[PDB]
Amino acid sequence: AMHPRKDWYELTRATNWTPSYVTEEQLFPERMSGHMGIPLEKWESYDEPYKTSYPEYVSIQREKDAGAYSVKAALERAKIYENSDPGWISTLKSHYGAIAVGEYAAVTGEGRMARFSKAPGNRNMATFGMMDELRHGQLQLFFPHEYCKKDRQFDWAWRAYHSNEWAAIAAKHFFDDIITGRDAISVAIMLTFSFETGFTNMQFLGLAADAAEAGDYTFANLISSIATDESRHAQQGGPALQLLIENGKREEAQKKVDMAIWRAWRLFAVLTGPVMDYYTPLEDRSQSFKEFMYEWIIGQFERSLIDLGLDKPWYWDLFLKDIDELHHSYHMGVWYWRTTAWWNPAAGVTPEERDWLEEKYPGWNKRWGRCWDVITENVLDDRMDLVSPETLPSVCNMSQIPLVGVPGDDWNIEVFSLEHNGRLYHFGSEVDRWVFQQDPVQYQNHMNIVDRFLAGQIQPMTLDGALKYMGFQSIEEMGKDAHDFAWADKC
């Protein structure tokens, strides 16, 4: 006979003890552990609600990978790359470049917790979390690897995080702040709770729904399988949050969640926003970016936040307004500076698409539509010099993304600046400025790509010089319009 897990599970997490040959603080130093002075005894009530055991883990994950790889193998000849819309291929390039090695970075966040969390249950679930992020990183290298021979841009599935390309810097700045650069309890709260029960669902399930509409079942099956792991190890954050609230640390827990959510929002607005409203072919848009946001972040994540005993963030109404506006301007920037991307942005402004954008965001044509009109006329007149930039955009000192606002009829743009220790910083939002002020030593001597440009670190100090600095190795890898402006035939 076998004995049921409920009967022996407690022994697997009976692993705390009172150190005698070193101090408790030497064994769990605050800068790595983040226990906020809560003594060891209090961490033993931590109870992970989504349990697993080593025998079940290796058996179930063997079945998950067998499914993912069997589907990839059976569809190798489905002509997805050849028959897909170029904007869909661009979505794959940006996803794999932005995610794959960041997943491998998440191994280090989970490892931080496996060594330095004072909660024995957390250290075991973080060990499975380490394994899950290994899976995620290896899958999302293995899958795009077969396209290297079609397109040098898929090399950026591996190369992006090794580059100084501006969007790789934005992703690394975020993940190094939330995942690899903070103590174990911060990781539990900012990564597993805030990011992996919130925005990760936009990218791995919202995009899966678009992939299924587009007919890419290898990709949809892949990223939805990845999300099943996230659903288990993301449950490490809830009990840590509850522990901090019950030990007098509600304010600190709220601040970390507030910070983490906003940082993820700005990055996912530039990566997922353009994908869902512009790169994905119209007929394959299952919902708009805003409708997905209201499903996954407002309807699901924010409600779960309240259920755990936390409050709506202080920036709630700022966040709702950003949802209507930010990614439209991020899209325009990524497109206008497409030569700095490792994918080929789709402009996505044929009349058919402009009608859909107007229905999903009333007033779109009077705002971003005004810029796309000038761009469209220049393409129709063969003034291609007017649709490529000769300067760089100003970049947020927090998100590492260009400083944007609403263009056109009711133009409004605000930079939120900050003098700090003899340096002038510029931020794209109130909240980004606030995030900086919560932890200046984390950020104050970092230099964004434009800071480096003006400091002489980018030679020659030209757009061409920035492209060499960003790591581009051939003309083919620089981004171009996804359709080679064939959409202008529709205008």
Partner 1 sequence: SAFPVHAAFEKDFLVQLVVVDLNDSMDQVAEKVAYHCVNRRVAPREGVMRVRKHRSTELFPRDMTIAESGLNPTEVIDVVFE
Partner 2 sequence: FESKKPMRTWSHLAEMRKKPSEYDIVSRKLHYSTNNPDSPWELSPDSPMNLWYKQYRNASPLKHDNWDAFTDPDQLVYRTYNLMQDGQESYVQSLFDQFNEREHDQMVREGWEHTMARCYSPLRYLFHCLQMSSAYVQQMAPASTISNCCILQTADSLRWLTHTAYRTHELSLTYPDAGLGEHERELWEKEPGWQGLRELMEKQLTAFDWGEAFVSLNLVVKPMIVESIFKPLQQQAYENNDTLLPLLIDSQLKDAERHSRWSKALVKHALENPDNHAVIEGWIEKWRPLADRAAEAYLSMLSSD
Partner 3 sequence: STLAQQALHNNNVGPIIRAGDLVEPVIETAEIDNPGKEITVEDRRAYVRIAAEGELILTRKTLEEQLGRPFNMQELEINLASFAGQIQADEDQIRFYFDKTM
Choosing among Fe ion, partner 2, partner 3, none, which partner's interface includes residue 294 (Cβ < 5 to 8 Å by kind)? partner 3
CB of 187 to Fe ion, least distance (A): 11
Cβ proximity to a copy of itself: between 76 and 377 the closer is 76
Closest to 435 measured CA to CA, from 314, 304, 288: 314
Cβ proximity to a copy of itself: between 71 and 141 the closer is 71
| Dihedrals phi, psi of 72, to nearest 5 degrees | -55, -45
Q: Are 180 and 109 in contact (CB under 8 A)?
A: yes
CB of 429 to partner 1, least distance (A): 13
Q: Are 262 and 431 in contact (CB under 8 A)?
A: yes
Applying CB under 8 A, does 333 fall inside the site for partner 1? yes
Applying CB under 6 A, does 133 fall inside the site for ligand [O-][O-]? yes
Residues linked to residue 412 through DSSP beta bridges, in sequence order: 406
CB of 430 to partner 1, least distance (A): 13
Is 359 a known ligand-binding residue? no
CB of 196 to ligand [O-][O-], least distance (A): 6
Applying CB under 8 A, does 393 fall inside the site for partner 1? yes
d(CA 88, CA 341): 15
Q: Quick one: which of 473, 484, 486, 490 contacts partner 2 (CB under 8 A)?
A: 473
Closest to 160 measured CA to CA, from 81, 105, 110, 222: 105
Q: Which of residues 433-452 bind partner 1 (CB under 8 A)?
A: 450
* Region binding partner 1 by CB under 8 A among candidate stretches 82-90, 280-288, 302-310, 406-414: 406-414
* Region binding a copy of itself by CB under 8 A among candidate stretches 60-68, 117-125, 169-177, 309-317: 60-68
Is 133 a known ligand-binding residue? yes
Choosing among ligand [O-][O-], partner 3, partner 1, none, which partner's interface includes residue 63 (Cβ < 5 to 8 Å by kind)? partner 3
CB of 79 to a copy of itself, least distance (A): 9
Is 331 a known ligand-binding residue? no
Per DSSP, the three-state class of 323 is helix
Q: Which of residues 184-223 bind a copy of itself (CB under 8 A)?
A: 212, 215, 217, 221
* Region binding partner 2 by CB under 8 A among candidate stretches 99-107, 204-212, 298-306, 342-350: 99-107
Applying CB under 8 A, does 272 fall inside the site for a copy of itself? no
Closest to 125 measured CA to CA, from 48, 180, 195: 48
Q: Quick one: which of 106, 205, 323, 347 contacts ligand [O-][O-] (CB under 6 A)?
A: 106
The residue type of 129 is G
Question: 34 in the Ramachandran plot: left (φ > 0), alpha (ψ -120 to 50) or beta?
Answer: left
Q: Contacts with partner 2: how many residues (CB under 8 A)?
A: 87
Residues linked to residue 416 through DSSP beta bridges, in sequence order: 427
The residue type of 185 is I
Q: Quick one: which of 3, 6, 77, 149 contacts a copy of itself (CB under 8 A)?
A: 77
How many C-beta atoms surround the C-beta of residue 114 within 10 A? 18
Per DSSP, the three-state class of 20 is coil
Using only C-alpha atoms, the chain has a radius of gyration, in whole angstroms, of 23
Is 103 a known ligand-binding residue? yes
Is 233 a known ligand-binding residue? yes
Burial of 1 (0-12, 13-18, 19+ CB in 10 A): exposed
Q: Are 180 and 45 in contact (CB under 8 A)?
A: no
Q: Which of residues 417-446 bind a copy of itself (CB under 8 A)?
A: none
d(CA 200, CA 344): 23
Question: Distance of alpha carbon 472 from its chain centroid, rounded?
Answer: 22
Residues linked to residue 402 through DSSP beta bridges, in sequence order: 395
Q: Judge if the upstream peptide bond of residue 402 is cis by omega within 30 degrees of 0.
A: no
Q: Quick one: which of 10, 63, 82, 390 contacts partner 1 (CB under 8 A)?
A: 390
Choosing among Fe ion, partner 1, partner 2, none, which partner's interface includes residue 137 (Cβ < 5 to 8 Å by kind)? partner 2
Applying CB under 8 A, does 50 fall inside the site for partner 1? no
Q: Name the one residue in this structure whose structure tokens are 């009976």.
A: 14
Q: Are 234 and 110 in contact (CB under 8 A)?
A: no
Quote the Cα angle for 392-394-395, to 5°. Answer: 115
Cβ proximity to partner 2: between 54 and 411 the closer is 54
Binding mask 293-312 for partner 2 (x = CB under 8 A): --------------------
Buried/exposed 23-32: b ≥16 CB within 10 Å, e otherwise: eeeeebeeee
Q: List, as residue ranges, the binding site for Fe cation.
A: 103, 133, 136, 196, 230, 233
Residues that bind partner 1 (CB under 8 A): 329, 332-333, 336, 368, 370-371, 373-375, 378, 386-387, 389-394, 402-409, 411, 413-415, 417, 424, 426, 450, 453-454
Residues that bind a copy of itself (CB under 8 A): 63, 66-67, 70-71, 73-75, 77-78, 212, 215, 217, 221
